[PDB]
Write a protein that binds this ligand. Sequence first.
Ligand SMILES: NC(=O)c1ccc[n+]([C@@H]2O[C@H](COP(=O)([O-])OP(=O)(O)OC[C@H]3O[C@@H](n4cnc5c(N)ncnc54)[C@H](O)[C@@H]3O)[C@@H](O)[C@H]2O)c1
Ligand SMILES: NC(=O)c1ccc[n+]([C@@H]2O[C@H](COP(=O)([O-])OP(=O)(O)OC[C@H]3O[C@@H](n4cnc5c(N)ncnc54)[C@H](O)[C@@H]3O)[C@@H](O)[C@H]2O)c1
Ligand SMILES: NC(=O)c1ccc[n+]([C@@H]2O[C@H](COP(=O)([O-])OP(=O)(O)OC[C@H]3O[C@@H](n4cnc5c(N)ncnc54)[C@H](O)[C@@H]3O)[C@@H](O)[C@H]2O)c1
Ligand SMILES: NC(=O)c1ccc[n+]([C@@H]2O[C@H](COP(=O)([O-])OP(=O)(O)OC[C@H]3O[C@@H](n4cnc5c(N)ncnc54)[C@H](O)[C@@H]3O)[C@@H](O)[C@H]2O)c1
Ligand SMILES: NCCCCCCCNC(N)N
Ligand SMILES: NCCCCCCCNC(N)N
Ligand SMILES: NCCCCCCCNC(N)N
Ligand SMILES: NCCCCCCCNC(N)N
Lengths: 324, 336, 324, 336
Amino acid sequence: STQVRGYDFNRGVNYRALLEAFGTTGFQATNFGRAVQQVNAMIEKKLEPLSRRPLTSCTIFLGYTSNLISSGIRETIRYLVQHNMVDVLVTTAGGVEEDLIKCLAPTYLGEFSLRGKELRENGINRIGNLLVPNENYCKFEDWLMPILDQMVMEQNTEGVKWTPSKMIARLGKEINNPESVYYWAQKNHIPVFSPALTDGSLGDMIFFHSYKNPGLVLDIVEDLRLINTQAIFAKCTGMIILGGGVVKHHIANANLMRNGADYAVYINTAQEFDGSDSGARPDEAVSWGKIRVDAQPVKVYADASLVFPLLVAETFAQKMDAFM
Amino acid sequence: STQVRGYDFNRGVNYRALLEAFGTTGFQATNFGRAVQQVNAMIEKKLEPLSQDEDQHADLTQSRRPLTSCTIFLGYTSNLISSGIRETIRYLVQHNMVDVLVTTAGGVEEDLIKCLAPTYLGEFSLRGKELRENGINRIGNLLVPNENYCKFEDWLMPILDQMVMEQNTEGVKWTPSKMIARLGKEINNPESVYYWAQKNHIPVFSPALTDGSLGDMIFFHSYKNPGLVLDIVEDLRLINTQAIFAKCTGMIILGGGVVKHHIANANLMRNGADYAVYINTAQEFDGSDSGARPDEAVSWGKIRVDAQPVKVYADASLVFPLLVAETFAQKMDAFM
Amino acid sequence: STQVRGYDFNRGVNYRALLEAFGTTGFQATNFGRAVQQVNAMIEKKLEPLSRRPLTSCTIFLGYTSNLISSGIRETIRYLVQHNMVDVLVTTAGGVEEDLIKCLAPTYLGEFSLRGKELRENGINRIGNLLVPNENYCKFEDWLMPILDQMVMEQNTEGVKWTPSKMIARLGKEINNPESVYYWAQKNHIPVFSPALTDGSLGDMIFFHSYKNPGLVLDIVEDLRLINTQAIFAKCTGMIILGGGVVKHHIANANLMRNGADYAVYINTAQEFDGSDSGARPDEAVSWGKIRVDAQPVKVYADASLVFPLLVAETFAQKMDAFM
Amino acid sequence: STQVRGYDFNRGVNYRALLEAFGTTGFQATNFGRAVQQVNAMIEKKLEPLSQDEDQHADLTQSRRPLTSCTIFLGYTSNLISSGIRETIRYLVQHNMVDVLVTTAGGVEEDLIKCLAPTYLGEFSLRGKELRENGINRIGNLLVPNENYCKFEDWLMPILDQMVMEQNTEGVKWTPSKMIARLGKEINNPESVYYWAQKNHIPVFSPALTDGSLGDMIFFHSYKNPGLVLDIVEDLRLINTQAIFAKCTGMIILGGGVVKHHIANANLMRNGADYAVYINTAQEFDGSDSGARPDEAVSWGKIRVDAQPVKVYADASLVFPLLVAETFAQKMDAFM
Ligand SMILES: NC(=O)c1ccc[n+]([C@@H]2O[C@H](COP(=O)([O-])OP(=O)(O)OC[C@H]3O[C@@H](n4cnc5c(N)ncnc54)[C@H](O)[C@@H]3O)[C@@H](O)[C@H]2O)c1
Ligand SMILES: NC(=O)c1ccc[n+]([C@@H]2O[C@H](COP(=O)([O-])OP(=O)(O)OC[C@H]3O[C@@H](n4cnc5c(N)ncnc54)[C@H](O)[C@@H]3O)[C@@H](O)[C@H]2O)c1
Ligand SMILES: NC(=O)c1ccc[n+]([C@@H]2O[C@H](COP(=O)([O-])OP(=O)(O)OC[C@H]3O[C@@H](n4cnc5c(N)ncnc54)[C@H](O)[C@@H]3O)[C@@H](O)[C@H]2O)c1
Ligand SMILES: NC(=O)c1ccc[n+]([C@@H]2O[C@H](COP(=O)([O-])OP(=O)(O)OC[C@H]3O[C@@H](n4cnc5c(N)ncnc54)[C@H](O)[C@@H]3O)[C@@H](O)[C@H]2O)c1
Ligand SMILES: NCCCCCCCNC(N)N
Ligand SMILES: NCCCCCCCNC(N)N
Ligand SMILES: NCCCCCCCNC(N)N
Ligand SMILES: NCCCCCCCNC(N)N
């Protein structure tokens, strides 16, 4: 029986102690504490001694919505991928393309209230309280077109059967920049799944390109086999899912194929009342077999832009020595 | 300047008057009233004849669906097909009231499965362990027996066999929309959304069609009968061309995610939708595309600067049937 | 085992049938259906044959946040009070004052996005997507001051011991206008509780008045006795609570005094994750004894401006004959 | 123009740098960074000396609390005292870092009760029937035993007897703030927020003080010892005068409801606060005062037009300790 107690600033400011105190603070602070414990359990299982990716004792799936790549959480995710701390990525199309675009031009801070008419008149696109100039996408187009030319050529003459994961690996290799999530993912043989890869600017570009160079095919069937087999052949699995939608369901349903994940942490701002998959508590997933009945899953109800860097500080970044 | 005033029940339960009074009630009631006006504007435009010039341009797609003065995109999250909103959507599709559907994979498969076995009412709080032990799957406060998916497997597997054979011997290049049309034709049931969609030449887009039970089945099927391809590139061309060659467009988007962005992004290709109504429970603060206001879409060119879009912040299970009652259902005579 | 099924518009548009179909539609539509059933159960219990208010077989407490009086839900609430359909009102201070102010000057439709600087420069105050001109409050001041003079005089010479409920009764009598909730409440001997009655424009006015005419006392202790005894001596109780905060807790805690309400319907947009009383599910209230263990309470997760008029249409307005 | 960039953990776990990087991370991380800046602006102003002219005007209240160049109002919902945020608030009050407190009744009583018995961790999903049967009360994912309130009754009843006697024999005119000061003096415990508040002459306002357990006790007490009066009118004068005679004001408001409006409305009386930070989980769509953006308050004159207020959309149990770490705790030396 753990008593409720907050951090006492009469101690001064020890940030480690402050973060530790979340566990006994209550409400979502307590859930954050539980999430730290669950992610540390995944890491410790992964470090136990026992696709071209070599198996470890715990396969960790990391999912995140596209806007988190628009955000500075791009840097957090890149760090985990760079150091081979997770095994599978799932993100929607924006989450792919904006990582690449950020190697060409930056995204800027703005405000949620900025009016669309005036932004559009000035060639600026709004993402929440962020701003992306039109020119960023012009640079993306210039960079991407010759790559898409090569991909079509390789498909039609070298027998390459493109899927989203294979395209994402290629784009990461091409961007050739260590600030990029997907550069690191391909270097470290971490596959990235994104079944609706056409839903975004990369889609726009594929679309425009296809009238100059028809023929590109992106198959989603083989990518389903690939993600599901990552779960089926795992010794243990953990799911860390930031946001909802496709990224959440796709990871959770892959884990249904092994009769459920062993560990699970959700950080999202959705709620159950609307019947949404996004908003479903981890315990809904237990009814399906996506999370094992004996698992102790955790959801933090919060914006991941606040919570994820703190979670990484207290988990993966603490075990940096073991990952090298 | 409009004064705030709610419906006065001293007048009795005059339902039409009650619904009209939402417009002057405030908060989301007022946004509902605005949504009714915006959808009625789409419908009024749709029923306007095409001039010679407009007909020429609108006829530049290869689809055999007859031309109207307003191409209406209807998007909905999968859970809304789990819900009774399935019946609302089916009605609109049955009577050619909308032109393009976008839904995620659950929103395809569960329409088909509901022709085989029903979904039941439950409660949000039911615990997963006991449900799993009794072979019941939870969708919010709804319940789907394991047996529903067994029936789906039995129905679907022979269709998947035919699809692979048609691919390999007849050169069929499958995409999600083509598969959804075929599944609708196969289910052959007037209670099905997708039966009516294919019958009425209304394309359905679902670029992550593998994300659900239909995916499970494709996956298992592929080990006995390998090589089925679902191309998403051709389907991107198809949805975007629906927007590009429209005289006007309206978007009616229930929920967020892929369904919302995919429709809105198609409309960027024509420099923006003329009309838009969002009904969703998302909020902007998290930076989500789901929670972005219509005015964010204006910055991108997905909604015209001159448009007067509306978002209703509510569960669509409450709002959508009311919206349809006051809009499409009022003009049903024109659609027959 | 009830099957999920929505209203079939091939029937045409029968609004009664459409509303009935919410029950089998799922998510919050199903909760709305359950709410209709629970409120009808309250009404039917109230109509069973057995403070100056005569007891009925079910005492119904109606609570609502202040903004719902800013809204057109003012008209919905007024109707119920006018016809003696509920027994006790609880609202916060705005919910009192704006009912009175609306008899003097209207509130207007606006938009949530309107900027504060320009509104303030034009003498307009924003309430969500509503607008209240400064002049409305000038009219309120002119109307209220001579009443406050009388109240002080009655306190100091006729021994009147003012409380929020007594003040609200008096203001209702004074406004003398059948569009007013509180005019009807006092006419029908329905008490109104508002322990923080100073938190709003009526507060501002009491504050300004007190420097011209010092002495007014508003006691909250006697009003606690009054509300709690409404619950203690009831044969049965029902709670209908629109929104959260003081209005929700105050009604629910009164019902703790009788060991719990027999029926309960919440309609609010709050969520549990933040630990808020506003967001607590009805089942939290069961742990306290505020709702009986054998009750079947219902929460609808929605804006009451949408849901409440529909609920009244299917419940109280259907039994209009029995209430006359 | 500031570029979006998150903290790079290749630099190691440098916590100060990690927290500073929230400002360029986007969404609510950026709003957190803005809140840190806004609170530090309040603190910097507070530590600025009062000029002769400013001192004269600021000294026009009867309170004996020493004058500062920025009067800081701290508001919090009751549940935040149920939580460990009680410790965060106590620290600020202990060291005279804020000037006026506003909380609802739970936020008073539970601070006192925590000196008598602890609150425990639980879970949101725990069912009410079984909790009730075991004499346990649920607050979100926290748990309070029945016995805690028995202990509160035993402690409080003799104090209520003294208060009634002082009213009737010494002419004491009780208000919520005066009662809260007395209860703080009586609890006589350095872990208590209200012990420190009364010691440091920080008034606490709670106009619905009867809405909770303290109310329960007053109610039961009144049948044995009738006639206790709690006047809310005098307390309105007292809070509003704190704003009217301030050189500058800042508002730090955790959660919504009475606590938020009461602080903001007091600041309308001086034509608006100079600085404001809201941390709450409410949204604007429902028309709620709780969910109104800071810019709504600008229309009323509760926040100055020239102010740059900030709302962080998050559970304060996560955000507030981080905010304090980066603001008040950094300047602790100046407050001693
Ligand atoms: N930058 C972009 O957002 C962007 C760019 C191009 C394309 N798109 C397209 O939009 C579509 C929908 O985007 P999506 O599926 O990535 O998610 P989304 O933005 O629709 O979010 C889905 C849900 O995830 C949760 N969520 C979102 N942001 C969160 C946060 N910061 N913290 C916690 N929870 C959060 C919310 O509850 C939200 O409703 C995708 O197909 C995507 O490719 C997005
Ligand atoms: N029945 C199912 O929900 C189901 C079944 C199988 C697969 N899936 C898969 O789950 C994935 C995610 O589902 P999704 O993208 O359809 O949406 P989702 O359920 O994740 O919801 C996305 C957002 O839409 C909004 N929303 C959801 N329900 C709403 C309602 N009733 N009213 C208003 N707004 C609402 C919410 O803000 C939510 O965060 C999809 O790829 C889908 O195929 C879902
Ligand atoms: N018009 C006004 O709102 C107004 C005017 C003057 C004073 N005030 C003061 O503001 C203070 C706080 O206001 P409050 O306590 O009345 O409530 P609030 O507006 O703080 O709302 C509390 C909670 O109730 C729920 N809620 C609000 N509106 C809702 C809706 N339309 N549908 C469903 N749920 C809803 C929300 O979850 C919200 O967080 C009060 O003391 C009041 O006197 C308000
Ligand atoms: N422990 C308790 O909660 C408790 C105990 C006894 C009595 N009560 C009574 O309940 C009534 C209502 O409580 P209240 O007015 O203190 O607020 P509340 O709990 O009703 O919350 C009001 C709004 O504040 C916001 N909020 C709540 N918790 C938050 C968090 N952790 N972070 C960010 N925002 C948050 C939410 O939007 C919420 O709707 C009061 O009169 C109080 O005395 C409460
Ligand atoms: N193998 C298919 C799994 C489908 C799970 C769908 C869960 C949807 N849950 C909500 N919409 N709440
Ligand atoms: N043509 C590409 C359009 C991409 C739009 C992405 C908008 C994302 N908005 C958020 N608030 N996430
Ligand atoms: N008789 C006093 C009852 C106090 C109940 C407080 C309940 C608070 N619940 C949350 N904050 N979730
Ligand atoms: N001096 C009286 C101020 C009253 C302000 C009320 C603002 C209510 N705002 C909402 N969004 N409810």
